[PDB]
Paper text:
Human cytosolic prolyl-tRNA synthetase (HcProRS) catalyses the formation of the prolyl-tRNAPro, playing an important role in protein synthesis. Notably, glutamyl-prolyl-tRNA synthetase (EPRS) is a dual function enzyme that catalyses the formation of charged glutamyl-tRNA and prolyl-tRNA in the cytoplasm. The human ProRS (HcProRS) activity is located at the C-terminal region of this protein and inhibition of this enzyme has been recognized as a promising approach for treatment of HcProRS-related diseases. Inhibition of HcProRS activity has been shown to have potential benefits in the treatment of fibrosis, autoimmune diseases and cancer.
To further clarify the binding mechanism of the identified hits, we determined five co-crystal structures of HcProRS in complex with the corresponding compound and Pro at a resolution range of 2.2–2.7 Å. In the presence of the natural substrate Pro, the Tm of HcProRS increased by 4 °C. Normalized by this control, the presence of five of the 17 compounds, including 4h (R = 2-Cl) and 4j (R = 2-CF3), significantly improved the thermal stability of HcProRS resulting with ∆Tm values in a range of 2 to 7 °C suggesting these compounds are likely binding to HcProRS in a Pro-dependent manner. The EC50 values of 4h (R = 2-Cl) and 4j (R = 2-CF3) proved 6-fold better than R = 2-CH3 in compound 4d, indicating that the electron withdrawing properties might be beneficial for binding. Similar phenomenon was also observed for the 3.6-fold lower EC50 of double substituted compound 3b (R = 2-Cl) when compared with the single substituted 4h. Combined, the positive electrostatic potential of this binding pocket indicated that an electronegative substituent at ortho-position of the C3-amine benzyl ring is likely better than neutral or electron-deficient substituents. This is evidenced by the 7-fold better binding potency of 2-Cl and 2-CF3 substituted compound 4h and 4j compared with 2-CH3 substituted 4d and 2-fold lower EC50 of 3b (2-Cl) relative to 3c (2-CH3). However, in our ligand-bound structures, no electron density of equivalent water is observed, and the ortho-substituents (2-Cl, 2-CF3 and 2-CH3) of our compounds seem to replace this structured water. The similar stabilization of the benzyl ring was also detected for the other studied 2-substituted compounds 4d and 4h.
Author numbering:
A (entry chain A): 1015 to 1512
B (entry chain B): 1015 to 1463, 1474 to 1512
Write the structure that this text describes.
């Protein structure tokens, strides 16, 4: 079973959920974690849905080198400035020192865009739409946490280059909506589409959009994905240039975008839907949607009778495969049935299917929901339609409960004292914000200073999350920021973050 | 158009094929090459086949960290000794030096097996069958060539741990059989299944089974894949143990294998099937099997008739997509039909589908085979039937000629003199060999006066080693017929 309680101490609960579900194994290098097949299948499920959608947009998959030269990495000044201290450098091969240290990619902007310049000579070479699934390394100055914050992580990064800004801006929102579909339709997690502030925006871009998710156990929010508009800052440094047919003889710099989604998605799914019985898989991403377990195999049952009980389970397995239900039949005669119930509950299989000798003679079986523990006795001939209905209802309620949790935890506050008090209750707040960096740092410093949390809870100030595309309330004209010294530009979502 | 010719300068011909087919782009870090969509789509075709086959064997996909500690890397002494010079070491996080350098994986044995030991607590925990599709770094010191020998490459690496030795021995030959299917059933390249010698076997294992392919244009053979039996060399170092089911108090060490296939497959495909017209894709791994191109679009053609020809091309697109044939209609307005002819030829699309106004009105179209250049006028009715037949014809034609090239370039020699003659003729010779590492160093140094190195001990050699035959050196008796030759 599970020892820790998600409501009391969240860290060891998360640590026990990711291990006992066989998702995460630990490594002797801090910030690096093993993705076991149970977690990796979730990533493959996300990969299969996102690949199919970006190919509709004309995006193609490729793979670029992981090593970056010093000169390439420092073409964009403000970009390398933000990533320099967290870049891992290869300095030697074997015992021989490298003449020039090469870098491990924290992101592939400076690796790809030299090639973009070579590939783009005429206007016919645009647009370039490329994506790659790969690993990056970010030796960050933060507490590592599996899935959420790791030194090495798997992701997709898509880099598109266009002749006009209207083409680029269109794709930014197209991709961000795809990231929102990954969270809301696959992981059953609600997200808030928004724009990052000037402080938290991608270094080297004009603006960045993001989806923010909420983790109610810790009251903290987390970034689920970003779609940046790079404008021309990178094409001006890497010389991604073409001649426009309408503007004779003049150098045109391409408009570029980048967008990324990481294996953090798995950790958010764990933090939102996991309970005190272990992991909870949304049926959409569940590696196994239905696990079939033979029950009641006493020593008195004959060898022929036991084989007929196994055959009925395999028959349920074939029936569910013919209707595209991902089903595993745990026929292993080496483990107890209660060990199997516990094993697959920890892993989060949405439905457990129990077949016993009495039920098989009676033309029925038992279906047990993972999210609620509700046990239903279903007729043998209704197995294909009933289970698919339960699988759909599990996905709906997981998103319904997470949405109602989000609606009640994201509110509006206009003054600093109400923003402070609501923040200390475990909520994220939309406040009228002037949109300046020095004020955002002031909020980060004063929310941590005036904090009143539970005994033992560490000091953590609120930071910017996003400027929501559709905020909760309209900003009344002339309304000042929460600092009182500058006019407010927009409602900005704030709160403690991962 | 391609400037170089395969018969003259193979190096410059190869550099121009991979770039003009838009497979490879070059990078300012020596030995690292960009895999563009046309190349990566081949790797995906290899991946979806191979992944489907190992799932039937109970192998599951995962992903282990790229960084390995000094202590974990040096646990197996023979394994770390062979890889030590070619391991890249991270020593700096920005400008702050790590207290201890960490290494980029050249292979993931020392990364995964510490986790294998924690997972194997009893007999119930075996077998463990894990595979990952990832990048790996081996910092070579020889001149790099795209696909064939690169500083960083993509691969899959399977690691399996078994309770018995018969189990691991079964899987080693099962995986090698799948590698043979990848090269023969998909890439249409014949391979020679064999066994590495003591000098060439995987450091840290007991034996290595490999598939060796031959590049006829250069006369040098190349290793297509390997499946190693690690035995207990690693489980005795990383403490992967389990209680003896029969004897209480006695530990048993797991029997392990490892097996890998890299993106070198694409380069071997290029070097074998490519011609002076450019790349030649086998239809089974071809991203685009058929390209539809509208022809005869003159400036005087009526917009109605011009629109009718466009629709006719999309009608073939809908029909071919209905019979699971990968087809793209190149209806782009800013490129001439002749430009698209040479464009898809360079990339290796097996069949070109030409639709002109005269051929459309006569209910016909043209089919151009990439391998032979034959042009076939086909009626609109027998489209899905004949195009499917040509695609399978292209697949068997490419294999039959590469198998015929391998038959006439792999002969048997019996002494040092005649082995040198056939080797410098651009062929690989099977010779009676004593298996010693001493003679393997001598045969490479002598026949260079480059040089032929051990490739594999064929599972099925050409001639049966008659009893009494000694090695080509003369000192020791010959223990088996071995295939030698210059290799990449
Ligand atoms: N070190 C990290 O920030 C991290 N670690 C593990 C997983 N995701 C991480 N980042 C999240 C992220 C990064 C880039 C683009 C989009 C996103 Cl959502
Ligand atoms: N540096 C290289 O040797 C190399 N470079 C690119 C591609 N494959 C490479 N190795 C071949 C290889 C390696 C492991 C297992 C099987 C094989 Cl076939
Ligand atoms: O790292 C980032 O945030 C952007 C998005 C993917 C590519 N680079
Ligand atoms: O490098 C090799 O040859 C073995 C096989 C894959 C993993 N390691
Ligand atoms: Sr920084
Ligand atoms: Sr000019
Ligand atoms: Zn302010
Ligand atoms: Zn000898």
């Amino acid at each position: 079973g599970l020892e820790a309680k998600k409501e009391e101490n969240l860290a060891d609960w998360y640590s026990q959920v990711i291990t006992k579900s066989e998702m995460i194994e630990y490594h002797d290098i801090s910030g690096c974690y093993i993705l076991r097949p149970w977690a990796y299948a979730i990533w493959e499920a996300i990969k299969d849905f996102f690949d199919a959608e970006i190919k509709k947009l004309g995006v193609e998959n490729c793979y670029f080198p992981m090593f970056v030269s010093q000169s390439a990495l420092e073409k964009e000044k403000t970009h390398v400035a933000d990533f320099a201290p967290e870049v891992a450098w290869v300095t030697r091969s074997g015992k021989t020192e490298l003449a020039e240290p090469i870098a491990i990619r924290p992101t592939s902007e400076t690796v790809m865009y030299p090639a973009y310049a070579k590939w783009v000579q005429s206007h016919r070479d645009l647009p370039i739409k490329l994506n790659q699934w790969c690993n990056v390394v970010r030796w960050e100055f933060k507490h590592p946490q599996p899935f959420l914050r790791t030194r090495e992580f798997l992701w997709q990064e898509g880099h598109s280059a266009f002749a006009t800004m209207e083409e680029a801006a269109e794709e930014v929102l197209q991709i961000l909506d795809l990231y929102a579909q990954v969270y809301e339709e696959l992981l059953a997690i609600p997200v808030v589409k928004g724009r990052k502030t000037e402080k938290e925006k991608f270094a080297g871009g004009d603006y960045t959009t993001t989806i923010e998710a909420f983790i109610s156990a810790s009251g903290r929010a987390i970034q689920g994905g970003t779609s940046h508009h790079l404008g021309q800052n990178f094409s001006k440094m890497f010389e991604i240039v073409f001649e426009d047919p309408k503007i004779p003889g003049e150098k045109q710099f391409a408009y570029q975008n980048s967008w990324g989604l990481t294996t953090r998605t798995i950790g958010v799914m764990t933090m939102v839907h996991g309970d005190n019985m272990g992991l909870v898989l949304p049926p959409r991403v569940a590696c196994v949607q239905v696990v079939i377990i033979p029950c009641g195999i006493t020593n008195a049952l004959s060898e022929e009778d036991k084989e007929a009980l196994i055959a009925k389970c395999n028959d349920y397995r074939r029936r569910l495969l013919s209707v595209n239900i991902r089903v595993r039949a745990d026929l292993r005669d080496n483990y107890s049935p209660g060990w199997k119930f516990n094993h697959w509950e920890l892993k989060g299989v949405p439905i457990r299917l129990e077949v016993g000798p009495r039920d098989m003679k009676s033309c029925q079986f038992v279906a047990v929901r993972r999210d609620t523990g509700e046990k239903l006795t279903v007729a043998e001939n209704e197995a294909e339609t009933k289970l698919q209905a339960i699988l759909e209802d599990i996905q709906v309620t997981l998103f319904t409960r997470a949405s109602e949790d989000l609606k009640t935890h994201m509110v509006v506050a206009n003054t600093m004292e109400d923003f402070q008090k609501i923040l200390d209750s475990g909520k994220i707040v939309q406040i009228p914000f002037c949109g300046e960096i020095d004020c955002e740092d002031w909020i980060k410093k004063t929310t941590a200073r005036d904090q009143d949390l539970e005994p033992g809870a560490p000091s953590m100030g609120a930071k910017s999350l996003c400027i929501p595309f559709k905020p909760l309330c309209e900003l009344q004209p002339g309304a000042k920021c929460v600092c009182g010294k500058n006019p407010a530009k927009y409602y900005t979502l704030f709160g403690r973050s991962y």
